[PDB]
Amino acid sequence: AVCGSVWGQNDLAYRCRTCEHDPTCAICVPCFQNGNHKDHDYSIMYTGGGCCDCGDTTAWKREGFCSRHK
Numbered sequence: 001a002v003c004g005s006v007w008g009q010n011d012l013a014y015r016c017r018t019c020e021h022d023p024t025c026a027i028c029v030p031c032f033q034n035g036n037h038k039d040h041d042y043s044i045m046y047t048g049g050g051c052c053d054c055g056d057t058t059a060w061k062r063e064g065f066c067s068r069h070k
């Protein structure tokens with residue numbers, strides 16, 4: 001249902017300003033790759049570590065969920 005990926009400080013992840021509900025939101029690289037963000041305002045970057053928001057309706061717009069957590 002909600003991605004259980006976690007990553008550390010020096011691990012890349014994705015922000016998407018089109019899909020996020022808060023600037024602190026982020027999704028893991030595989031969730032980004034398996035979703036649809038063309039023409040979105042997204043950036044690969046470091047986030048200080050985190051837990052993936054893919055699948056969480058409180059953190060991420062449903063249209064931005066990957067195929068595996070939709």
Ligand SMILES: [Zn+2]
Binds near residue numbers: 017
């Ligand atoms: Zn997006």
Ligand SMILES: [Zn+2]
Binds near residue numbers: 004005031053
């Ligand atoms: Zn994920």
Ligand SMILES: [Zn+2]
Binds near residue numbers: 031070
């Ligand atoms: Zn996902």
